[PDB]
Design an enzyme around this catalytic site. Structure first.
Site, PDB file in Angstrom:
ATOM      1  CB  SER A  62      17.701 -18.967  18.966  1.00  0.00           C
ATOM      2  OG  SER A  62      17.862 -20.362  19.154  1.00  0.00           O
ATOM      3  N   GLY A  63      18.706 -16.568  16.874  1.00  0.00           N
ATOM      4  CA  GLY A  63      18.537 -15.208  16.408  1.00  0.00           C
ATOM      5  C   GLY A  63      19.804 -14.386  16.352  1.00  0.00           C
ATOM      6  CB  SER A  64      23.352 -15.085  17.119  1.00  0.00           C
ATOM      7  OG  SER A  64      23.299 -16.426  16.666  1.00  0.00           O
ATOM      8  N   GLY A  65      22.347 -14.715  14.116  1.00  0.00           N
ATOM      9  CA  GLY A  65      22.684 -14.420  12.738  1.00  0.00           C
ATOM     10  C   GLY A  65      23.599 -15.455  12.117  1.00  0.00           C
ATOM     11  CE  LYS A  66      21.672 -20.599  15.225  1.00  0.00           C
ATOM     12  NZ  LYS A  66      20.724 -20.667  14.078  1.00  0.00           N
TER      13      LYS A  66
ATOM     14  CB  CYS B 118      -0.941  -0.010   1.204  1.00  0.00           C
ATOM     15  SG  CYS B 118      -0.250  -0.765   2.698  1.00  0.00           S
TER      16      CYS B 118
ATOM     17  N   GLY C 175      26.326 -20.155  18.914  1.00  0.00           N
ATOM     18  CA  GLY C 175      25.690 -18.920  19.331  1.00  0.00           C
ATOM     19  C   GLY C 175      24.263 -19.181  19.755  1.00  0.00           C
TER      20      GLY C 175
HETATM   21  N1  LIG Z   1      14.234 -15.039   5.601  1.00  0.00           N
HETATM   22  C1  LIG Z   1      14.392 -13.929   6.362  1.00  0.00           C
HETATM   23  N2  LIG Z   1      13.982 -12.717   5.926  1.00  0.00           N
HETATM   24  C2  LIG Z   1      14.133 -11.607   6.672  1.00  0.00           C
HETATM   25  N3  LIG Z   1      14.694 -11.600   7.894  1.00  0.00           N
HETATM   26  C3  LIG Z   1      15.149 -12.746   8.456  1.00  0.00           C
HETATM   27  C4  LIG Z   1      15.021 -14.002   7.701  1.00  0.00           C
HETATM   28  N4  LIG Z   1      15.544 -14.971   8.475  1.00  0.00           N
HETATM   29  C5  LIG Z   1      15.972 -14.388   9.623  1.00  0.00           C
HETATM   30  N5  LIG Z   1      15.739 -13.062   9.611  1.00  0.00           N
HETATM   31  C6  LIG Z   1      16.078 -12.119  10.705  1.00  0.00           C
HETATM   32  O1  LIG Z   1      17.474 -12.207  10.994  1.00  0.00           O
HETATM   33  C7  LIG Z   1      17.701 -12.300  12.401  1.00  0.00           C
HETATM   34  C8  LIG Z   1      18.746 -13.373  12.679  1.00  0.00           C
HETATM   35  O2  LIG Z   1      18.139 -14.658  12.550  1.00  0.00           O
HETATM   36  P1  LIG Z   1      19.029 -15.999  12.506  1.00  0.00           P
HETATM   37  O3  LIG Z   1      20.022 -15.949  13.642  1.00  0.00           O
HETATM   38  O4  LIG Z   1      19.520 -16.194  11.092  1.00  0.00           O
HETATM   39  O5  LIG Z   1      17.944 -17.139  12.847  1.00  0.00           O
HETATM   40  P2  LIG Z   1      18.306 -18.698  12.679  1.00  0.00           P
HETATM   41  O6  LIG Z   1      19.740 -18.790  13.143  1.00  0.00           O
HETATM   42  O7  LIG Z   1      17.317 -19.396  13.582  1.00  0.00           O
HETATM   43  O8  LIG Z   1      18.099 -18.967  11.209  1.00  0.00           O
HETATM   44  C9  LIG Z   1      16.368 -12.625  13.059  1.00  0.00           C
HETATM   45  O9  LIG Z   1      16.093 -11.692  14.107  1.00  0.00           O
HETATM   46  C10 LIG Z   1      15.322 -12.503  11.968  1.00  0.00           C
HETATM   47  O10 LIG Z   1      14.377 -11.484  12.303  1.00  0.00           O
HETATM   48 MG   LIG Z   2      19.542 -20.755  12.243  1.00  0.00          MG
END
Ligand SMILES: Nc1ncnc2c1ncn2[C@@H]1O[C@H](COP(=O)(O)OP(=O)(O)O)[C@@H](O)[C@H]1O
Ligand SMILES: [Mg+2]
Ligand SMILES: Nc1ncnc2c1ncn2[C@@H]1O[C@H](COP(=O)(O)OP(=O)(O)O)[C@@H](O)[C@H]1O
Ligand SMILES: [Mg+2]
Lengths: 697, 697
Positions: free
Chosen positions: B507-511, B11, B505
């Site tokens: 969960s949600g760290s960015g691995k 939108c 790390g």
């Molecule tokens: N496909 C995606 N699109 C947009 N943002 C994402 C996506 N996957 C994860 N994120 C964001 O990136 C951040 C890091 O997530 P991440 O550590 O990669 O999760 P996991 O390790 O469980 O895959 C999260 O806070 C999430 O909001």
């Molecule tokens: Mg993961």
């Protein structure tokens, strides 16, 4: 006999119904599906055997190969195939077999492809002593047509409008006859103007009558559709819990468009049958009055039209089914390729997916071309018949005028009456597609309406009981979801009144289901639940749902005002207790922080708030406090600990450290309790509970 | 400007495009949607201002009040509103406002209602110094019509068939004139038979030509549809990764129905315009030859029909949109009521939900009755026009016959040609709700087609780089998912070649995100990734995906043969390689047990088997060994520890104790590494790693 399946999970129920109908016992498919214990995954093996044994069949299961099929067996038998899909065989002829699957119908297969698709699992049946033949079903079309009884004045104003409309049309058709026979031939001008004005007025009256009739028909259809939909929804909301978890959401939502189809039938077909038959009688009488031979030609035309229409109506439906299946497969392939795009992209294999999807889009096109060919052939044959019949009618009229059996404009008037007589009859003829799907939808919707309700399933209700104040005794209780693995085996316990109790276990132990039975969701197949010396089945069902509050791990808030949320089951409350509970359950601050006014953690605290607002005798929280913060955790702990009015409180938890201060602790490991006692006694009494306590710290 | 939103989440981009168009800058909506950084959750004010500033606008964000609306400022602006939607205001007149919303169109609102719905956030836009205008869009109807350029023999084989069908119909419509003018009056029988047989033969030839033309039209439509859908899908499977996670699956699947609508436009409208134009020109010339006044009457009839059709076609579309919205609301209510039946049953509120459902059903019925009345009015007016025009034509023809301007059967021939001329024009007029719904679908489908894919966005490839073996360098890098908060801040790592590395790390760290950047998915705005001394952006993209294997946190397996799923990338693989890959990750025993021999834990081990079948230079696996038991865990651990050919292996885990024997351990705590080194070295250095290790044991 091959009964069409209504959903994607009732293949075995459909096969069993076909067997029963072949053996002379016809019953509702919903009752059979309930008897087989069918779930959202379908009846694996045991449901068919159990239901056949209950119905009187001497059911048995055996694993057979191609060699066993040669010798012999009973002709009615269910064969397991892998294309949640079962297929029933009927006979063994010379190197051919016949199968009537619910998905397609009566089809024939060779032995080789059969053993390629037919899994070794096989079910054999044979009627027993208690197999009294009967017809335990009701004509659902009559039941839904009974909804027309209140609407007996709008129907009358529609039949009269149709009669007057057709009379006006027939009277106005003769304009072309009056033009050529008298007006044009004798050179009359003032009479021409007067007669033209009169016929224009007649046509305007016809149009106004059509407008009125269309408005009335639309109103009647809307009313009938709304009534049917409301009836279905009101009966659905009353069904037991085993009906909901055994069906998908779409399986229950499709009945609304089923009701829409039912309305399309009753509003349209019932009226148009009488309208068209009477108008066709009038038209045929008039055509016979004008000329017999031309009327006979018209009758032949309409007979050929009807024959062709039905003959091409059948394979058109078959081809539509096939193209729908192919489109569904293509959509599934697209979903799989799109939702897993990451792995596809991180291989360099994008080119393979294009070819894989093209090989399915081409199949969709080649399956749509069959329906297109059928439609084209039907249209060409119908056009040939209609046009050649019209030309032959003009030819015969010219010949009769030459022989002086009729007079000029009489032929054109006969053409107008021919249109006015053939259109209603063809409209009546091309109704089979509507009425067939209408009967299908009517049966599909009326199957549910015969299901037993929660209130009538209760054996009896006590009167002098006002509250559930009493010790909660659990004798030897057995419970199993449908015909699946057992969950409750020998659970025996006693909950005292006014004492907080915590039950702890791991995921999948069977604690949420225990809470479910605690408040009369489902029933224990063995044993009984005793409250104050009274069984749970002998007291009022609505009383149990009113004096027991339950909060699960998947709480939710409906799309509505918060006042409705906090008084979901109560209609007469005053704001004082609402505010108290909002403060009591740590939710007033959240709402005040939230914008406006009283008009996952938030949802959870709202759940305990409404549960406590219920003010029950038993208050159950399964996996609720673990999703709050430490401050909220201890606040809720001391708030639920300081509850007056002698309220029994049960907390089921998966973390030992979360809840410590109860009088008695229950532990369930594998469908049974191993230890029971206070935490101080649990530490001293060596057991599994001590092991989990050590491993959790 | 109130350009319709093609997606439910775009939108804000729609309002931005409307503002740009009103200010003289027109561009594709997909470019703005990707430019604004729109995600599956919709856009916000920051994206709007960033996109406008990049486009050259002097965008700004400010919070206003009701009194601010009374004050005079920049009228064209985007105002936030929660139903979170965006509406652009155009003018604030005397006690009235003018807005334009993509969901509905352009409407007006009141100050009280707006202030009740309008959120305080406001965005102001104004062009800057460097705001050169342009029109960066293509007339996409022409581009899709260009698919007809190679298929020009079929079109030329349809136009001639239509011409011959027209000639046959026109010639055969004079049968009624021949009957009454000469044949009936002079009492000729043999001539009657001969002429009637000739006209029947003409009609049969007409039917055969219609059959052939229908076959050709169906084939042309099928070919065009297949080509368009294949082109769209092949372009979609090439777009960058940020396109798929910023859209829903349905938003990418509905484009196939859009392509079907495009085909319906090209196959039907383009051909029928020319066919009916020629047909109507010939018919009008013939009618003017027959008589002038009756031709003028027919022209007036068709003019009235067209006027009525358009005038009632607009509000019919409006009412259809409204009833569709009401039906969507009703079905959402039913879904939310039936998927939460547990609380409803255990609160006693079965009656209240019935009341709410009945209210919504009544609203749906009213919104349907509005469209029913619109249809009834349109049909009544059209029927009045048609019938009264036919009566007037008959009256005028009779008067002309009386006055000796025409003669008898010429009037019936004029009636036949009148039908033959009015039907094409009244079918070409009914083409209005085809071009509109075709242009909108064409724009919606083709805005994607011009989006730049992965290959063109690449800077430059390399020629002498064939192997990715070497040190992996992660300089200081920034990475934000579109325009959201950053996740990658200062991650600098060094991975030695051929050395196993473990990354741990929370969960949600960015691995997983870091693993994705490693495989060139997305791109860091600041920083770079170095492979053995060469930047990742300077290598051909096909090389990276061919030399790096990925095992994600949730492997999916596309339906098909397991051999195909293991050879997903390479189509030339020997059997022994598959055998050793199955033996590489504990897969042979499971596959050999399944039906035949080679046609969650099982799927994930299949994924790992495919990963080692890829024989890559770098192998990244996250959450790959969690689901397997300890036996498979240790087997795969020893299997992957002793890898040859200098293969770099990265294992990402959240359980510290799962992996112990990697050379270097990396920790991700909050967008930054806290320490890097071997297991023994890091424990001695007190820090985060020791804290988490002690808290996990
Ligand atoms: N496909 C995606 N699109 C947009 N943002 C994402 C996506 N996957 C994860 N994120 C964001 O990136 C951040 C890091 O997530 P991440 O550590 O990669 O999760 P996991 O390790 O469980 O895959 C999260 O806070 C999430 O909001
Ligand atoms: Mg993961
Ligand atoms: N709708 C259902 N159909 C079939 N089986 C079910 C259904 N719901 C639960 N079960 C089974 O019954 C058991 C109930 O366990 P549950 O009470 O959910 O344990 P917990 O309370 O620890 O979550 C589960 O192990 C599950 O396998
Ligand atoms: Mg549970």
């Amino acid at each position: 006999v091959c009964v069409r399946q209504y959903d994607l999970t009732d293949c075995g129920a459909a096969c069993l119904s076909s067997i029963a109908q072949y053996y002379g016992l016809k019953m509702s498919l919903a009752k059979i599906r309930e008897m087989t214990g069918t779930d959202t995954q379908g009846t694996n093996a045991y449901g068919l055997i159990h239901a056949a044994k209950q119905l009187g069949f001497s059911a048995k299961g055996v694993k057979a190969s191609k060699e066993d099929l040669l010798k012999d067996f009973r002709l009615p038998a269910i064969a397991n195939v892998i294309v949640a899909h079962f297929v029933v065989i009927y006979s063994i002829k010379n190197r051919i077999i016949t199968v009537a699957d619910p998905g397609k119908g009566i089809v024939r297969y060779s032995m080789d492809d059969f053993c390629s698709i037919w899994t070794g699992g096989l079910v054999l049946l044979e009627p027993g002593e208690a197999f009294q033949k009967g017809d335990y079903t009701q004509n659902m079309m009559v039941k839904f047509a009974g909804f027309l009884k209140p609407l007996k004045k709008t129907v009358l104003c529609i039949f009269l409008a149709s009669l007057l409309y057709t009379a006006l049309g027939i009277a106005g058709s003769f304009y072309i006859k009056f033009l050529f026979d008298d007006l044009i031939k004798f050179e009359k001008l003032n009479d021409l103007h007067i007669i033209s004005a009169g016929f224009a007025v007649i046509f305007l009256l016809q149009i106004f009558l059509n407008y009125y009739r269309s408005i009335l028909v639309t109103k009647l259809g809307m009313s009938i559709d709304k009534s049917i939909m409301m009836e279905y929804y009101s009966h659905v909301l009353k069904l037991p819990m085993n009906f909901f978890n055994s069906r998908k959401v779409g399986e229950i939502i499709s009945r609304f468009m089923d009701a829409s189809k039912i309305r399309q039938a009753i509003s349209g077909a019932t009226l148009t049958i009488m309208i068209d038959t009477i108008m066709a009688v009038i038209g045929g009488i008039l055509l016979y009055i004008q000329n017999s031979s031309l009327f006979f030609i018209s009758f032949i035309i309409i007979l050929l039209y009807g024959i062709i229409v039905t003959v091409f109506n059948k394979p058109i439906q078959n081809a539509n089914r096939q193209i729908m299946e192919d489109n569904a497969k293509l959509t599934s392939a697209l979903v799989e390729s799109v939702k897993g795009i990451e792995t596809i992209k991180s291989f360099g294999a994008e080119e393979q997916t294009e070819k894989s999807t093209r090989d399915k889009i081409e199949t969709v096109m080649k399956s749509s071309f069959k329906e297109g060919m059928l439609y084209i052939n039907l249209s060409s044959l119908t056009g040939i018949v209609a046009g050649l019949g019209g030309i032959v009618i003009l030819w015969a009229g010219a010949y009769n005028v030459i022989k002086g059996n009729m007079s000029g404009g009489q032929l054109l008037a006969f053409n107008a009456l021919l249109a006015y007589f053939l259109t209603p009859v063809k409209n009546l003829i091309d109704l089979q597609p509507l009425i067939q799907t209408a009967v299908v939808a009517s049966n599909r919707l009326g199957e549910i309406l015969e299901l037993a309700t929660e209130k009538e399933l209760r054996e009896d209700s006590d009167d002098f009981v006002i509250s559930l104040k009493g010790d909660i005794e659990f004798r030897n209780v057995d419970f199993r979801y449908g015909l699946r693995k057992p969950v409750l085996k020998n659970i025996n316990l006693t909950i005292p009144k006014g004492k907080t109790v915590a039950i702890v276990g791991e995921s999948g132990s069977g604690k949420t289901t225990l809470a479910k039975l605690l408040m009369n969701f489902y029933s224990p197949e063995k044993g009984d639940i005793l409250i104050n010396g009274h069984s749970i089945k002998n007291i009022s069902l609505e009383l149990i749902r009113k004096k027991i509050a339950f909060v699960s791990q998947d709480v939710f808030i409906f799309s509505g005002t918060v006042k409705e949320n906090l008084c979901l089951g109560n209609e007469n409350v005053d704001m004082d207790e609402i505010i108290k509970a909002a403060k009591m359950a740590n939710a007033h601050d959240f709402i005040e922080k939230l914008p406006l006014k009283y008009d996952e953690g938030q949802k959870q605290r709202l759940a305990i708030a409404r549960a406590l607002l219920k003010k029950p005798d038993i208050l159950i929280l399964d996996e609720a406090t673990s999703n709050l913060d430490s401050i909220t955790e201890n606040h809720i702990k001391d708030a639920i600990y300081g509850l007056e009015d002698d309220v029994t409180v049960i907390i089921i938890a998966h973390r030992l450290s979360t809840i410590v201060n109860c009088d008695k602790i229950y532990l369930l490991k594998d469908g049974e309790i191993v230890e029971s006692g206070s935490h101080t006694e649990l530490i001293a009494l060596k057991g599994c509970y001590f092991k989990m306590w050590k491993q959790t710290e």
